[PDB]
Point group: C5
Chain length 347, copies 5
C-alpha cells in the first residue's frame, strides 16, 4: 500500500503533478519494461523498412502499413478493457473490506468476559487469540506474503498464535479441506464454557459474543471465496489477447512511411511514434493496474499490508482485552459539567 | 471453477501472457468451433467470388460488399453486448454469494446445543444434517451437476442426507411446489424441542439458532429465485441476433475485393481477414463468457463446484458439531503472557 | 416469467441459437407490429419516390434524403436509451426482491408458537394467514393480474384470506389510505396475546416473531413505494421521443436513391433497407424490453407470476405451520455416525 | 409525483406513445421556454445573416459557421451530462428511501405497549406522535412544501404534532443546531418510563422499540445529510457551462448557409433546424430532469408528496396504535381448516 | 461544504444559470490558474509561429501542427478520466457516510443509563464523551482541519474531550498503532460497570449499548481504512499523465495555421482557441473535481466540515444525555384524541 492521502488533502495548482515524481507503487515501475520492448520492436521494424527492404518490398510494406492502420480499429480494446478494469477494481475494494478485524470482538470481550484474576485473563486472551489465529490461517491460505512469513503450521505455533496442545488437536482433526474455521469453533466452545462458569454473566452477552464471532468468521470465509473464485479466466485471456493483438497491429500500422510517396496522412517523419507510445502507455498501464489489483494479497507495492495488519491486530487485541480490562479512570466531572486554534435548505 | 489467483499474485513482466497457454476454462476451448465456422463461411464466399462469379457478377458482388461494409456499423453490437454482459456478470457473482454455507450454523450449534452423551450428539448432528439436506435439495433443483449426482430422492437417502423415516414424512407431505424448505421447518421444530428439553440452555441461544437458520434458508430461497427468474429472454434473443446479424454482414462486407478495381480502401489482398477474425474472436468471446456465466450451476469448466461444496460442507459441519464439541485444549498461558522469516495522513 | 435456465446450463456450440426459436416471451412477439409499421411506411415513401414524384421533385427529395441521413446522428438515441434501460432493469430486479415471502415467518412460527390442540393450530394458522392477507392486499393494489383475481374485498373473503368478522373490522376502520398494513397490526396484537397466554414461551421468541413481521411488512411497503414512485415521466417521454424522431428521420434518410444520380454512398439499390430494419429492430427492441419490465406486475409473458406466488406461499405456510408442527421423525443415528453417480492460492 | 404505473402494466403496440400526451410532470412543461429561447436566438441570427450582412460579411459569417460546426464537437456534452444525471438519479432514489415511515414503529408499539385504559392509550399515542413530530421537523427543515405548510413551530403546535408544554421544553433547550432529534430522545425516555411502569412487559420489547426508534431516527438524519451535502457545485457548474457553451456554438455552427456557395454539406436550406432543435430538446431535457430531481423535496410535479406522506403517516400511526390495539376478531377456523376469476431448472 | 439545495428546489427557467455566479466552491476558483497557464503557453507558441519562425520553419511547424492535431486523439482522455472520477465520487460519498455520529448512542444512553443524581449524570456524560473522544482521535488522524485544531493530545485534553487521568492512561498504553479505539474499550468497560452497578437495569439494554458502540467504532475504523487505502497511485498518475500529454499535444495541434496556405480545415484565423479552451476547461475541471474530492477531509471549500460536526455532535450528545434525561412533559391528550396553509396502480 502506497499512501498519498495527505499530499492530496487540498486541490492545489500543482496538485497531481507532484505525484508524478513517485517511483514506488508507480506506473513507470510497473510498465517501463513493456514500454521498452514495444519501442524496441517498433524501432527494429522501422530500421528494417528504412535500410533493408528494397523499393518494391518497401511499396508492399507501405500498403501493409496502411491496411493495418485502417483496420486495427476493429479490435475493441477499450470496450473489453474498461469492463475488465471495473470488475477488478470492485473486487479489489470488496476484498479489502473482507479482511477480518478483531476490534468489535475485542470490545465485546472486554465488556463481557470478566475476572481480574489469572483465569479471566486466560479467557479473554484465548478468545482474542483464537480470532487472530483464524485470521492468520486464512491469510496464509490466500496471501503469498503471509505464507512466506508462515510457510508451515510450525511457524504459526512459534509465532505464538497456536499452542502445542492446540496444534495436536488441530492436526488430529481428519479433514481434507482448509481448517481456518477450527479456531472459530474453539471460540464458540470456550465462550460457552465461560458462560457456564459465570465469567460471562448473562445469555445476552454470550449471544453478542457469538454474533461478533460469526461476523469475523464470515469475513474469513469471504476471503477464502475471493481467493477461490478468480475473475473468469476467459475475461483475462480475452483482454490480454485484445491488448496484445491491437499493439502488434500498431507495430506495423503506426510505422512512419516515406513522405516522398505522397501517402495520405503520412507527411511528417518523426521517427519516434510519440502518440503511439502514449496510447500504449495508457492502455498497457490500465491493464497493468488490473494485473496488480487482481490479487491484492501478493507482494506488489500497492498490495495490502497483510503482515502489518496481522501484527497490529494481535497487539491491539491483546492490549484491549488484557491491559485495558476494568482499567478505567475514576468517574470525574468533565470540563463542561456546569456549561479552535447550517439548519436546512428551507431555513 | 478454474483458479489462477496464485499465478497473478504479483504484476510481473510476463504477467497475463502466461495465462494464454491454459486450455481448461479458456476462451479457445469455448470459441474454436464458432471461429472455424465463421472462417469456413468466409473462405467459401471468397472462393466463390474469386473462381465462380463472372465479371459482371463480380462487379455486382463488389458493390454489395462495399454496401455491407459501410452499413454494417448500424448494428449496435457493443451497445447491447456490454449491457448484457454486465447484467450476466453481476448475476453470476450474486448467485455465488447465495450458495448456503453451514459455517455460522455449525459454530452456533457447537456453542449452544449441549450434551456429551448420545442424545446431544444426535441433536447437533441432526440439526447440521437438516441444514445440509435443505442445501442439497435446492442445489439438485437448480444445478445439473448436483441433479446428476442425485437424480432421485432415493439417491439423497442413500447419500445419508435423509433417513428412511424422514423420507416417508417428506413424501407424505401434500405439496406441488419445491420442498427444499421442509428440512428448515424440521430444524425449527427440533431446536424448539432441544430448548424445551434443556439441551439449549437459554432463550437467547434458541433465538440465535433460529436467526442463523433463517439466513441459511434465505440463501436457499435466493438460489431458487435466481434459477426461476432468468435473465429476460428478450435480452438474450436481442444480443444473439445482434451478434449473428453483424457477423453475417461482415461475411460479405469484409471480403477482399480485387485490387485492380481501384476501390477505395481495397488495395491489399491478404486473403485471410485477420482483423475481421480478431473482431469476431473478441465479440463472440464476450458473448460466450456471458453464455457460460448465465447459468453458473452447469458443467462448464468455470461453473461453480457444487458437488465439492456439498461434500466439504457436510464433512466440516459434522466434524465441527460432533468431534470438536467441548473438545478444547486446557487454558494455557500464551507466548506473550508477560510481554517474520502508519498512523494517518496528518501524522 | 419465461424460464430458460436449464437450456443454458452449459455453453454449447449452438448455445443461444436455440433460444431464437422461442415465441412466448420473445422479442418477435413484442416487436413484430412495430417493425411491420416501420417497413410499411418506408415502403410507401419508397414507392412514392419511385413512381409518383416528378424529376425535379425527385431531385429535391434526394437532397432531403441526404440531409436527413447526415443530420439524424444528432439525436442521441443510444445515450438516452442505455441509461433508461439500466434504470428500468435495476428497478425490475429490486421489485422482484421486494415481493413478500412467508418462509422466514413460517419457520419462526413453527418454532415459537406452541400447542398441538385446536387453539395452537388456530394461533399458527391465523398468524400465517395474516401475513398472506397483507401480501394479497398489497399485490392486488400493485398488480393487475392479482387485482383481476381479486377485484373486490369480497373476493378476498371468498378466497379464504379474510374472514367475515375480520372483513367487518377491516371495513369499519376509518382511513382513506391503502390498508395493506392492517393484517400486520393484527399479527402484532395476536402475537402479543399468544405470548401473554403462554403459547409463546419466552420474550425472545416474541421479539423474533416481531422482527420477522417487520421484515415482511417492509417488503410489502417497498412494493407499494415502487408502485407509487414510477420512473420519472420525463425520462420515459424523452426516450420515446428520441426513438420516434430518430426513426422518423431514418424513414427519409435511409431511402434508396437512384444510382444513376451518382450520389456518394448511393450506388446499390437493394429496395429493402436490411440494415435500417436491423437497427430499428435492435433499438425498438431495447425500448420494448424496457416497456415490458417497467411494470413487472402486468400480464406480459416475462412479468412476475404473482398469482402462482400467492397460491404457493399460502399452501406452503399452512403446511409448515399446521401439518409439520411438532411432527419430526425420531432422532436416529445417521449414515456416518461411526465415520457420486482446493486449499488456497498459496498451497 | 406523477404516477403512470397502471398505464404501462403491459407492453402494448402504442405503449409509450400514449404517455406523450401528458402535460403535468412532462418534458414539454419543463423545457418549452428554453426551447423557445433557443429557437428565437437561432432565428434572429438567421435573419441577420439573410437580410442584414453584406456579401463580404456573409462570406466571413459562412467561414465562422463552418469553423463552429467543425469544432463544437470538442465540448464533451454527453460525457459530463451522463455522469451528472446518473449521480443525480441515484441520489434521488436514495433520498426517497430515506423518508421516515412509522409502520415498523407502530406495529412494535401496538404489540409491546399495553393497557386498554387512558394511560396506555396515552403512551402509545405519544410514542407515535413523537416519531411523527421528529419526521415533521426534519421534513420542514429539508422540504420547501413542508416548510410552507409549517413556516413556524407555532404551526407545528397548532397542527397537533407538538403540545404547548412540549413546545416550552423544545424552545428552552439551548442548542444552535437543528432539533429534529429531540422527539427521538423524548421517545427513548418515555419508552424507558413505560417499561419501568410495567406497560412494556419485558426488556426484549423495550430493546425492539429502541431499535425501531434508531432506524427511524437514522432515516431522519439521512434526510438531513442529503439536504446538507449537495451534489458538488463544481459538477453542476461544469455541466451547465458545457450545455450552454455547446448550444451557443450550435447557434452559429448549425446555421443554414447559402446553397449557392457550394459549401460541402450545405446544400438544402430548410430554414428551421429540425435536428439541431431535436438535439437541444434531448440534451437540455436530460439536464432539466437532473434539475428537477436534484432536490426532490421542492414543488415540482415529480417531486415527492411530503405533505401527503405526513398526513398519511400520522393518520395510520394513530389508527394502528389506538383504534386497532387489542382489537382482534375472535380466533375462527379459516376456510381451509380441513383441507381464480415450476420446480427448478433440472426438473 | 457549499450547500445550494434550496436554490435548486424547483426546476425553473433560469435554474442552473444562477449557480454560475457563485465563486466559493466553484470551478472557476479551482481552475483559473491552470486555464491561464494553458492560454499563456498557447499564446507564446502562436506568437513564435507568427513573428519568429522563418518561412521554411513555418512550413515545418504547420506540418507538425497537422500531425499533432490528427494523432492527439490516440490518447484516451475521457476513457481514463470517467473511470477515475466515478471511483473518486463513490469513495467520496462512502467516506461521508462513514463519519461517526453519536445520535443512536445518545438515544440508547438516555433510554438505558439511569439515575438523576450526580453518578448517573457522570455515567451518561462519560459514555457520550468517550464516543466523542474516539471520533475526535480518528478525525485528527485523517483530517487536516481537525489536526490543525488538535495538533497534540494536549489540545484534546484542553478541549475537554479527554481528562488528565485518562490522558495518563492513554499515554501509558504501550502501542505503536493509532489509539483511536481506546475510548471504545473504555466505553465497553464503563457500560459493564454501570450494568453491574444497577444503573443499566437489564442485560438487553447493555447488549443494545454494546451494539451501538460497535456501529460507532466501525465507522471510525472505516474512516481509518479510507485514509490508509488511497486510490491506487497508478490510476492517479495515469490520469494526470493522460490529461497533461493530451493538452500538451493540443498546444501544438490546435494552433491557428496561416489561412493563405490552403490547409484543409485551417481557413479561419480566430487567434484565440475558443473551443480548445472550452475542452481544456471541461476536462481539467473534471480532473480538478476529482482532485478536490479525493481527500474530502482537507480544507477545500467543498470538503466536509469536520470541526463543525465535532462541535455539533458533542453539544447535542451532552444535551441529550444530561439535560434531556427523564425530562419529559406530562402525558397529555393530543389534539386528535377524540377524532395546511393514491391507493395503487390498479385502483
Ligand atoms: Ca497483486
Ligand atoms: Ca454455465
Ligand atoms: Ca410489464
Ligand atoms: Ca425538485
Ligand atoms: Ca479535498
Ligand atoms: Cl437480540
Amino acid at each position: 500500500t502506497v499512501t498519498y492521502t495527505a499530499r492530496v488533502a487540498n486541490a492545489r495548482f500543482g496538485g497531481f503533478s507532484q505525484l508524478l515524481l513517485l517511483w514506488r507503487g508507480s506506473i513507470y515501475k510497473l510498465l517501463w519494461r513493456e514500454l521498452l520492448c514495444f519501442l524496441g520492436f517498433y524501432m527494429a521494424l522501422s530500421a528494417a523498412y528504412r535500410f533493408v527492404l528494397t523499393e518494391g518490398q518497401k511499396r508492399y510494406f507501405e500498403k501493409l502499413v496502411i491496411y493495418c492502420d485502417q483496420y486495427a480499429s476493429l479490435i475493441p480494446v477499450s470496450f473489453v478493457l474498461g469492463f475488465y478494469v471495473t470488475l477488478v477494481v470492485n473486487r479489489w475494494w470488496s476484498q479489502y473490506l473482507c479482511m477480518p478485524l478483531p476490534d468489535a470482538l475485542m470490545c465485546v470481550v472486554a465488556g463481557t468476559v470478566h475476572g481480574r484474576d489469572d483465569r479471566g485473563r486466560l479467557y479473554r486472551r484465548t478468545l482474542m487469540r483464537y480470532a487472530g489465529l483464524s485470521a492468520v490461517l486464512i491469510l496464509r491460505s490466500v496471501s503469498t506474503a503471509v505464507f512466506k512469513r508462515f510457510p508451515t503450521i510450525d511457524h504459526v505455533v512459534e509465532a505464538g498464535f497456536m499452542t502445542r496442545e492446540e496444534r495436536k488437536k488441530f492436526e488430529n482433526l481428519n479433514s481434507s479441506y482448509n481448517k481456518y474455521w477450527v479456531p472459530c469453533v474453539w471460540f464458540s466452545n470456550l465462550a460457552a464454557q465461560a458462560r457456564r462458569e459465570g465469567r460471562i454473566r448473562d445469555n445476552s452477552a454470550l449471544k453478542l459474543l457469538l454474533e461478533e464471532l460469526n461476523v469475523f468468521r464470515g469475513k474469513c470465509g469471504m476471503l477464502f471465496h475471493y481467493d477461490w473464485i478468480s475473475v473468469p479466466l476467459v475475461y483475462t485471456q480475452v483482454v490480454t489477447i485484445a491488448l496484445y493483438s491491437y499493439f502488434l497491429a500498431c507495430l506495423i500500422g503506426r510505422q512512419f512511411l516515406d513522405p516522398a510517396q505522397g501517402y495520405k496522412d503520412h507527411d511528417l517523419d518523426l521517427c519516434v511514434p510519440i502518440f503511439t507510445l502514449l496510447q500504449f502507455f495508457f492502455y498497457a498501464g490500465w491493464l497493468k493496474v488490473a494485473e496488480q489489483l487482481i490479487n491484492p494479497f501478493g507482494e506488489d507495492d500497492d498490495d495490502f499490508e497483510t503482515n502489518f495488519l496481522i501484527d497490529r491486530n494481535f497487539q491491539v487485541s491483546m492490549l484491549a482485552v488484557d491491559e485495558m480490562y476494568d482499567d478505567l479512570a475514576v468517574l470525574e466531572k468533565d470540563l463542561y459539567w456546569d456549561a479552535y486554534t447550517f439548519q436546512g435548505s428551507t431555513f
